[PDB]
Amino acid sequence: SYTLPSLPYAYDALEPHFDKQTMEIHHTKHHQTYVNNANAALESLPEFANLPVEELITKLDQLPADKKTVLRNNAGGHANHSLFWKGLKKGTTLQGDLKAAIERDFGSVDNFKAEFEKAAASRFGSGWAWLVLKGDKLAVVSTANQDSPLMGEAISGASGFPIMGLDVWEHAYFLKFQNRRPDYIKEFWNVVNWDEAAARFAAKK
Amino acid sequence: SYTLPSLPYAYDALEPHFDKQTMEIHHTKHHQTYVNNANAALESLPEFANLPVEELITKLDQLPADKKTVLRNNAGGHANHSLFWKGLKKGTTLQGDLKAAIERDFGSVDNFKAEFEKAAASRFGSGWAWLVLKGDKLAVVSTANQDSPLMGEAISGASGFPIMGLDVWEHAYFLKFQNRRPDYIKEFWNVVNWDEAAARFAAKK
Numbered sequence: 001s002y003t004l005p006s007l008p009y010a011y012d013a014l015e016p017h018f019d020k021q022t023m024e025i026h027h028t029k030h031h032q033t034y035v036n037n038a039n040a041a042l043e044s045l046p047e048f049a050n051l052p053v054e055e056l057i058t059k060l061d062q063l064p065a066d067k068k069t070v071l072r073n074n075a076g077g078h079a080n081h082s083l084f085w086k087g088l089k090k091g092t093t094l095q096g097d098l099k100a101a102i103e104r105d106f107g108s109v110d111n112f113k114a115e116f117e118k119a120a121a122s123r124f125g126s127g128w129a130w131l132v133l134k135g136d137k138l139a140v141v142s143t144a145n146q147d148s149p150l151m152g153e154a155i156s157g158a159s160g161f162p163i164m165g166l167d168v169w170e171h172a173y174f175l176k177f178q179n180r181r182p183d184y185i186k187e188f189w190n191v192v193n194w195d196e197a198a199a200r201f202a203a204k205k
Numbered sequence: 206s207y208t209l210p211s212l213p214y215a216y217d218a219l220e221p222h223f224d225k226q227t228m229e230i231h232h233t234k235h236h237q238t239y240v241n242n243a244n245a246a247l248e249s250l251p252e253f254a255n256l257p258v259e260e261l262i263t264k265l266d267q268l269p270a271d272k273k274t275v276l277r278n279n280a281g282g283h284a285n286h287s288l289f290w291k292g293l294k295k296g297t298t299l300q301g302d303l304k305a306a307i308e309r310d311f312g313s314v315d316n317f318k319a320e321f322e323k324a325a326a327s328r329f330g331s332g333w334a335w336l337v338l339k340g341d342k343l344a345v346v347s348t349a350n351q352d353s354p355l356m357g358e359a360i361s362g363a364s365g366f367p368i369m370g371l372d373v374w375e376h377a378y379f380l381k382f383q384n385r386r387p388d389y390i391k392e393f394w395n396v397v398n399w400d401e402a403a404a405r406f407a408a409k410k
């Protein structure tokens with residue numbers, strides 16, 4: 001079964017950029033709820049219940065017809081939030097092989113940032129913006145609700161290994177930013193954990 | 206040119222059910238943004254710009270290809286919130302012809318409320334739950350993001366003339382209910398404007 005993961009920091013570690021009350025709520029309520037609803041759906045699927053969530057969401061089409069939606073949504077939610085927390089940290093510097101590949105695939109870091117901001121802002125309703133690795137090339141993609149590019153193009157409309165990503169569901173920014181998702185997106189650059197993105201790139205490039 | 210409609214009541218007129226702080230942010234920030242972004246997209250379209258928003262969303266297939274998405278999203282937002290505000294009021298009662306119609310089509314009011322509650326809760330991500338009139342038969346449906354049944358099935362996945370509706374985007378309930386959407390859905394019964402729903406049923410158009 002799944003559990004709510006412990007975090008790489010206290011809820012206040014991303015201040016003054018991301019507010020600690022949202023961090024706490026986001027973890028103990030929203031993420032906890034995906035874990036709980038996934039666990040309920042997995043109760044009758046002992047074979048699938050053993051998989052890592054990040055693997056299960058690559059295998060949705062193998063589930064029973066009546067379980068696919070609820071696990072796409074909840075396992076997706078669990079996988080995406082588990083990744084998200086790892087990708088937040090202050091004080092990092094984009095550098096090394098990851099910086100070089102971003103420059104290569106988008107022309108410059110600023111270009112990538114503009115493209116990422118645009119995908120994040122233009123995702124209408126709930127969803128995520130991502131930096132994915134598609135074989136030998138990095139790309140910016142977005143998905144709806146709790147879909148993940150790990151689910152594949154057919155299900156999610158995107159594909160690739162997520163290097164990093166931004167939650168743009170309203171619960172992630174309402175308290176501090178209300179409807180100003182662009183302001184939230186700007187603050188994200190101060191807490192993007194480039195060290196984690198770098199480690200993930202190193203594992204997969 | 207669209208304009209943000211003033212509300213038919215003060216921001217605290219739906220207390221203690223729907224919280225006044227949310228009403229003001231919802232109206233003056235979120236709905237304002239749909240008005241502004243729709244207007245922006247319509248400036249180059251004099252043949253569409255001055256039509257009633259509820260007319261525009263019936264003719265999205267008539268638009269230029271590059272305009273269909275932005276106006277589906279923002280004209281739908283404007284149309285939907287305009288309905289919503291008028292479709293909220295304390296001190297009304299489900300009764301008369303509409304009450305009898307609902308009993309006819311759903312078996313009883315409680316059956317209907319259960320179905321509405323179910324559709325409102327099961328809309329994963331952002332969206333709306335609706336009571337619609339599909340040629341003389343009332344139905345419960347929901348849509349994603351700012352889609353409206355008035356847009357038709359191909360676009361919105363639903364159809365029929367909206368009688369009333371509930372906004373289940375997170376911003377509508379985050380401050381007072383956080384992630385507890387079933388709790389917000391229960392409170393909606395205390396503020397749904399059954400008089401305006403009855404007038405709309407009466408008109409059937």
Ligand code: MH2
Pocket residue numbers: 026030081167168169171172
């Ligand atoms: O989606 Mn948090």
Ligand code: MH2
Pocket residue numbers: 231235286372373374376377
């Ligand atoms: O969706 Mn207000």
